[PDB]
């Protein structure tokens, strides 16, 4: 809004909004720039990057864990409470999913994310 | 039941291996829902298939048995199967039409003064008879009649006849087709390949029939097609009464109601002026016709081969142009009967597709376009011109339908801005917006659309204020371009 | 009604609350008369689309 | 009903997906109450829209169908929609005016001695006809007539005519516009881009008409606009009788009574002296005119594009200057027809807006100012000069009205110092003072006003001693400045 | 089928019309009732739009109703089915026989 | 339940419910997806995973430590308090079991787990 | 329109390759906004260019 800052974020997979915990991460897909020095400082150098979305889901919810561990081609939407939205298409569930005391960690990853709306 | 087995009982219990040999080369009956095609054709006498009933054909021998040997439909099915063995083939026979079965006569006269051979090309089939020194025309006519009777695939029957007070050498052969229609007439040539000539002293001539025949009605056949989606249709009958019904049915299927897209491929044989007049007359965006003059083979064979090649190529990719694909087994016309560059360009401007002849003897597709030329108010319109446009539009519609029916089987509609929260299975116009954007990304990655920012800015999703259960969306895609013309200028320095 | 709405059966709450009316019967003296109106949720049936190609 | 659907019934019950293809690129009908604009234009024959009636236009095809193809209003609507697709567009047609439909003739003579091409630019539209060796002027005239008849968007009709005892090569084409008015005349050029030339031996000339036409009356149209707030108005008719009525209506709306602010954007085409005279003559603070000389395209296209760009930019932000925004699709005049620096500066001092040409072929806005030049007593006045000032004043008035009508729907007035205590819904001049201070803080944070202490010290809120229900407030804001001139001095040492 | 659907005006009976069915009608009725009962017991608000009938042979290609026939049947109080891309038969939309208001007008309720 | 979330988890071995501490982990058996980048981002790549159950058991309980260190072919059942159940068959006790101040850590592991009930 | 083509129609639809030979060695008409130059010179008889026009 006029002075509103981002306090919470919403993550939606295939239209189902996920019961996400506090502290949800988001890494846009782009170019990672490194540093080059020889006898002096010369410039930077690029490296491709992949979009990542991280969150935590309580256990026993509407969405089962077997469904979570079987996501290969899904649509992930990351929306901030202020109104900023990013869309991830053909995403997949990466890393090892674990149910640690009712906490399930999602590492939903995609090869390209664009800022819609 | 996919493979039809002969002399092998279906109830066998001895554990062993059963091996059978069969000369006919059948085609696997694997279902191809996205490559269903339909063919229209006539069936001669001794046919075992009921008229106006579609039947699945998977081998040339089966088609010949069902529709009779030498029939139009059997030859068309064989030509289709000799070039496309992956698409589902459906053939529906027709009636008999009006007219006469006579197609002309071949007149032979004179005596041969040297050893040689006489080669006659009837309906594109080579027929060679040995010629001895001193042989008369009557003996050559008898040998030709025997050779024609030997060949069972000729859609003509030959009888010998000699009369009048002329010399005994003269004797003409009367030809009669196996079916009645506008395509019953055939072409007769005596020298097609190089190094072939008529023996000296032998005079050969061909006199065509004077009457005109009419194509059979297709109303019953078009009514009995069914409700399946035939993506490609082969129509050999190039006459106004039949094409009007075909256009009506296709445009009824093309609408948003039926959603069963269909395309028709035809080939017209005649002079340049007739082809131009026909192309100018027809103004449909669902039929593509290719013009050819002086074709040794009948038109429907070319139509079947072209439809098979185009169907396979467009099923592999709906956006790749049809620029250099070749037609296997189709004889090109003579050197003096091929259209020049100006004629081909005018035909392309007149809604008639054009072909080309390879460096060898192969005939290749040049560019495939539809009959659509004129806007509704009468102006020129480049839309709906290339067949690639129609194929891409059909594929996009099918993909959108599949995505919507899969991702959202059965949901509940709510207005934008409402607070529904987690858990509920409701859908917001923003959700459909995002899903359409993702599908557009998939389309662009697949190589069908080019511009994304314009598509996103032109999107608009909203609910209907009257139905309350219908969501209205208006989108515009930017279909990608094709590489057709390569213009170059060379500035030599010498 | 809140439970019904959360279960995914009814949509509008304010209208339902404003149309509610609970009263006693002036004859039975043991019967309570209530008149309520729910707004049954809609179903997604028709998806109408229009494609404007540029080629 | 926002999306107009074709061939899709409104009463459908089969649960499925309905997809339709339509070539026309419509615009979403999302309401934009703060971006309502109105356009004035003429409509030719074969029109289906009643005159002096506003209609909402959301696509170029709809405008062409309603006002006839090639009409002024249809072209203006298409130009507006090709650059602004977010603002509400309302178009009201006009009558026919007085004058003659003839606009001039194109004379062609001579014979071509070499191969080439003849390019003619009529009303900014490129028309190319191939020229062969030995071709005569009459054949080229016939080809040009055929090409013009092919183009449906030209607001001219062409007929061929040959007479007199001159050579058969000479043949002139007569042009007649599709509507009558002061803007019916068009411009004809034969070489606009580089690398284009007339084939050798061909003589081309253009003779304009001698008569003068008059713009149609707008009294009925201006009376039938309605009561909505049209923030921006497009007026192509640059004549005193129409502009007087427009000024009267706008200044009646600009007053504190109507409070329906409106602005008018016009473009005048002519010589430098005529533009200067017009700018000096007009002294209104609600109309902005941009002068151009030797424009290949008609003036109203430039007016529509400029109004669309300005409306979008000012709706995004009322204080950002219009310094580098470009006009898409508008061809700049020739190199020798562009104003120099001194001419542009004099035009800016004379109340005429100026444009600029980008490093490429793009035309960009340079500075937009109003016609207001002279104080009431006759002195110079820099107030009401920049369009940003009017936009900011209108936005401030709207914001103040909204804040007052929202925070205080219906209250009770009491004098300052009275003891009303908690609970009562009364308002004191100190309350309005504080609310105005808070609104001023919001304005300053938004980037519209600069100085706060002076505004607070100049505020004064008091009750009326006669009405007893009216509160009188006198405030003065300090509108923020814009970055226009960057003066630099470089002192090299070499 | 159209005449029967127009004749009956009850809001407690739903009938599905089929022409040229190789199997007897009661088999289709039993399968459809089982599928509908399970689906509605799982959720009473989810539409019956794409559920398939297992083991039921669809009619011939020339005996299936067109789009106009299906729409008219839906307007006449007769439920309609559909044939999957393969040989499966699927429910299309299930509606009741109720068509007419008490005074004779049209009524979308029930 | 209607709004019930997972607060505790129960682990049962051969029918005997284990005296488990707070914070019990569970990793389902499936495919672990990695990330592939060369000159650009191309996609993911799979890797097999094995089911794991982790918990802590107080010392001196009904089940002795010698029994715990001798589990080669057992049945492990992981059930959440809400009702989600996973079954591990032919499981085994992995890693080093230690009795640290009355705490015994179990790393019960299996090659495949399916969600029953 | 950067390259001036001779005897090649602008409306061609046959998909093929069109090759032409021309003795004159033209220069590409790529715009160079930072390298615009002007030349003054006299023109003799039989000229086809209007005077005082760049």
């Amino acid at each position: 809004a006029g002075n509103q800052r981002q306090g919470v974020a919403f993550i939606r997979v295939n239209g189902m909004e996920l019961e996400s915990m506090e502290g949800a991460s988001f890494t846009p897909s782009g170019i990672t720039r490194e540093e080059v020095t020889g006898s002096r400082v010369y410039g930077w150098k690029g490296k491709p990057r992949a979009a990542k979305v991280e969150c935590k889901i309580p256990g026993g919810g509407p969405i089962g864990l077997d469904e979570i561990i079987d996501w290969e081609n899904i649509t992930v939407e990351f929306q901030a409470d202020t109104g900023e939205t990013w869309m991830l298409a053909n995403a997949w569930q990466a890393d090892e999913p674990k149910n640690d005391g009712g906490e399930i960690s999602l590492v939903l990853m995609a090869k390209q994310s664009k800022r819609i709306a | 039941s996919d493979i039809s087995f002969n002399a092998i009982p279906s109830d066998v219990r001895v554990p062993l291996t059963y091996i059978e040999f069969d000369n006919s080369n059948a085609v696997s009956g694997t279902p191809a829902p996205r490559q269903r095609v339909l063919m229209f054709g006539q069936s001669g006498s001794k046919a075992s298939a009921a008229p106006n009933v579609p039947v699945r054909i998977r081998s040339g021998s089966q088609a010949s048995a069902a529709f009779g040997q030498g029939s139009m439909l059997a030859l068309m099915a064989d030509a289709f199967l000799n070039a496309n063995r992956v698409a589902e083939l459906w053939c529906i026979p027709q009636g008999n039409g009006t007219g006469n079965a006579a197609v002309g006569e071949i007149s032979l006269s004179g005596t041969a003064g040297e050893n040689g051979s006489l080669v006659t090309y009837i309906a594109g089939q080579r027929l060679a008879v040995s010629v001895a020194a001193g042989a008369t025309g009557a003996a050559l006519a008898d040998l030709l009649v025997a050779r024609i009777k030997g060949q069972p695939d000729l859609p003509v029957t030959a009888e010998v006849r000699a009369d009048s007070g002329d010399d005994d050498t003269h004797a003409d052969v009367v030809l009669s087709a196996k079916f009645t229609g506008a395509l019953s007439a055939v072409d007769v040539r005596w020298n097609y390949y190089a190094g072939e000539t008529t023996p000296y002293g032998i005079i050969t001539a061909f006199k065509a029939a004077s009457g005109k025949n009419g194509n059979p009605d297709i109303s019953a056949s078009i009514a009995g097609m069914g409700d399946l989606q035939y993506k490609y249709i082969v129509m050999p009958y190039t006459d106004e009464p039949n094409l009007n019904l075909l256009r009506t049915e296709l445009q009824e299927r093309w609408g948003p109601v039926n959603q069963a897209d269909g395309f028709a491929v035809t080939v017209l044989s005649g002079t340049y002026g007739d082809i131009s007049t026909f192309g100018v007359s027809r103004n449909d965006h669902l039929i593509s016709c290719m013009g050819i003059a002086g074709a040794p083979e009948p038109s429907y064979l070319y139509a079947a081969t072209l439809c098979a090649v185009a169907s396979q190529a467009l099923s592999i990719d709906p956006a790749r142009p049809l620029q250099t694909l070749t037609l296997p087994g189709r004889m090109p016309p003579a050197v003096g009967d091929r259209f020049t560059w100006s004629e081909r360009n005018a035909l392309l401007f007149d809604g008639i597709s054009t072909f080309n002849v390879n460096d060898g003897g192969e005939m290749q597709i040049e560019r495939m376009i539809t009959m659509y030329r004129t806007n509704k108010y009468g102006d020129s319109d480049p839309s709906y011109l290339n067949v690639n446009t129609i194929a891409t539009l059909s594929y996009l519609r099918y993909s959108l339908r599949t995505r919507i029916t899969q991702k959202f089987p059965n949901y509940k509609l709510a207005s934008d801005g409402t607070r529904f929260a987690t858990g509920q299975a409701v859908v917001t116009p923003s959700v459909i917006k995002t899903e359409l954007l993702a599908l557009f990304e998939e389309w662009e990655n697949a190589g069908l659309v080019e511009d994304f920012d314009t598509f996103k800015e032109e999107l608009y999703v909203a609910r209907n204020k009257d139905d309350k259960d219908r969501l209205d969306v208006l989108c515009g895609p930017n279909l990608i371009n094709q590489f057709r013309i390569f213009a170059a200028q060379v500035q030599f320095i010498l």
Side-chain angles (χ1 to χ4, degrees), chain B residues 342-377:
Chain B
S342 307
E343 304 189 65
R344 293 210 294 284
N345 186 55
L347 281 184
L348 275 175
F349 264 103
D350 283 359
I352 288 278
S353 292
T354 52
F355 67 98
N356 200 357
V357 169
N358 196 0
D359 183 66
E362 296 293 328
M363 175 200 301
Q364 321 179 308
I365 313 182
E366 198 204 51
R367 180 169 176 172
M368 205 73 203
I369 63 163
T370 57
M371 278 286 180
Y372 185 82
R373 293 178 64 252
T374 300
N375 188 282
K376 187 180 290 294
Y377 275 133

Side-chain angles (χ1 to χ4, degrees), chain B residues 256 259 379 381 383-384 393 397 400-401 404 458 460 464-465 470 472-474:
Chain B
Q259 289 183 60
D379 311 308
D381 196 13
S383 298
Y384 296 128
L393 286 176
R397 160 199 278 180
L400 176 74
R401 168 152 34 91
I404 293 302
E458 306 269 17
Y460 167 62
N464 191 238
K465 51 206 59 174
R470 177 168 66 89
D472 299 330
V473 61
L474 187 146

Side-chain angles (χ1 to χ4, degrees), chain B residues 38-43 47-55 66-67 73 90-97 216-226 230 237 242 245:
Chain B
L38 184 64
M39 298 186 76
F40 287 94
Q42 274 190 235
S43 59
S48 56
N52 309 296
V53 161
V55 63
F67 315 127
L73 190 56
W90 294 76
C91 305
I92 179 162
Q94 297 303 112
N96 197 49
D217 196 11
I218 77 162
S219 55
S221 170
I222 201 173
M225 295 189 291
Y230 303 111
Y237 317 131
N242 289 1
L245 321 178

Side-chain angles (χ1 to χ4, degrees), chain B residues 34-37 84 86-87 231-232 308-319 391 395:
Chain B
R34 307 294 312 144
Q35 297 178 1
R36 285 198 293 268
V37 309
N84 189 304
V86 69
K231 189 175 287 293
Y232 304 102
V309 172
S311 56
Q312 187 176 3
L314 292 170
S315 290
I316 295 299
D317 189 287
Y395 182 75

